[PDB]
Design a protein around this ligand. Structure first.
Ligand SMILES: Nc1ncnc2c1ncn2[C@@H]1O[C@H](COP(=O)(O)OP(=O)(O)O)[C@@H](O)[C@H]1O
Ligand SMILES: [Mg+2]
Ligand code: NA
Ligand code: NA
Length: 381
């Protein structure tokens, strides 16, 4: 059948298929080309993707996300212990392994991270089957370059649990480079910087590609910096505004804050292609409408430190790879946040004007390369 590429992302996942000489990135039921890596459990059902994210404020302790932060890890991992303080859902210890614990159909139930990720993968599989009209079994699934064997194995296991035949687990920066055919240029080695700014994580990778070998020279970044932080800055901005205008602090009203957050995320996306964005929320709080706007300049100002700060891991990656800026053949934009004009300007300026590879939607580039690899491994390329 058709082999697919799946980017199983920390915040958003994406599925592509290579057929008839090109990659098609597949839209979900709602027409979205990426799907939130969310699973929710209710009195009646299990929800995955858009439907799960959509009900988070009304069911926060039974709505699971960030499974990628747990997958392949032990409960007593410092990372797991630290991350747990920022999740509304329970994480419990089963004989050393972390499990998310939720209420579901009126009973208490627990799931391993790879079970939760299996559900997201099931959804991605179903998305592909809905479009293709065919059973989808074979897949290439991607992971961050720094993932160890426990994390890779658990990611593969998530696929197996979802009934996927995982052809290979490949690195996200490798998938991005494959998408751009940077392994197929007429020449010897190519030094490639992958600048991946996603929803919750920032990954910089330097690869040296030669003879079909994607040597990881260095990785850097911030596992807790992404688009969510920019949204947070916007949310705080508007909470303060509403307090001034109406003498109401909406902060502890989970539904109101969530609706504001959704509006902010949308506005952010709009600001990547327009110089201003409208915020339009009926009855944000006590029936009070919240209709206003934000300029691209104000968004950039709110986030100025965070945007500039992405360059520090780039310098670090270069130093650790023992390469000058000028030795980089290709710069590749990955992750939805790299659509931000200010981020692109900062990075291009940092490379003293060098053109960026960004023709492939950055939030789709990983899935794109995974789809190409899947075709190669299934003999369809
Ligand atoms: N046009 C855009 N402009 C700015 N941010 C965007 C845009 N499109 C998506 N994003 C942001 O990208 C982030 C998701 O990145 P993505 O790479 O899809 O996920 P992940 O990091 O989970 O792989 C979210 O914070 C989302 O708001
Ligand atoms: Mg990603
Ligand atoms: Na993604
Ligand atoms: Na990332």
């Amino acid at each position: 059948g058709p082999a697919v590429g799946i980017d199983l992302g920390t915040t958003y996942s994406c599925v592509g298929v290579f057929q008839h000489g090109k990659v098609e990135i597949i839209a979900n039921d709602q027409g979205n080309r990426t799907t939130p890596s969310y699973v929710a459990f209710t009195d009646t059902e299990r929800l995955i993707g858009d439907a799960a994210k959509n009900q988070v404020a009304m069911n926060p302790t039974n709505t699971v996300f960030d499974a990628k932060r747990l997958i392949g890890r032990r409960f007593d991992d410092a990372v797991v212990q630290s991350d747990m303080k920022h999740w509304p859902f329970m994480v419990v210890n089963d004989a050393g392994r972390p499990k998310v614990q939720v209420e579901y159909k009126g009973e208490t139930k627990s799931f391993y991270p790879e079970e939760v990720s299996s559900m997201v993968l099931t959804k991605m599989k179903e998305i592909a089957e809905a479009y293709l009209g065919k059973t989808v079994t074979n897949a290439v699934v991607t992971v961050p370059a720094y993932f160890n064997d426990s994390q890779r194995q658990a990611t593969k296991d998530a696929g197996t649990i979802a009934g996927l035949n995982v052809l290979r687990i490949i690195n996200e920066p490798t998938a991005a480079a494959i998408a751009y055919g940077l392994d197929k240029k007429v020449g010897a080695e190519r030094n490639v910087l992958i600048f991946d700014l996603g929803g919750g994580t920032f990954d910089v990778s330097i690869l040296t590609i030669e003879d079909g070998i994607f040597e990881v020279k260095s990785t850097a970044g911030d596992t807790h910096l992404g688009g969510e932080d920019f949204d947070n800055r916007m949310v705080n901005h508007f909470i303060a505004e509403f307090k001034r205008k109406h003498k109401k602090d909406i902060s502890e009203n989970k539904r109101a804050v969530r609706r504001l957050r959704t509006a902010c995320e949308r506005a952010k996306r709009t600001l990547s292609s327009s110089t201003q964005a409208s915020i339009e929320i009926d009855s944000l709080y006590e029936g009070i409408d919240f209709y206003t706007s934000i300029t691209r300049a104000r968004f950039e100002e709110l986030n100025a430190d965070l945007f500039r700060g992405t360059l520090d891991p780039v310098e670090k990656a270069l130093r650790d790879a023992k390469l000058d800026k000028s030795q980089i053949h290709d710069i590749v934009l990955v992750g939805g946040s790299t659509r931000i004009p200010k981020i692109q300007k900062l990075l291009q300026d940092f490379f003293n004007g060098k053109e960026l590879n960004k023709s492939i939607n950055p939030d789709e580039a990983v899935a794109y390369g995974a789809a190409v690899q899947a075709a190669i491994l299934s003999g369809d390329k």
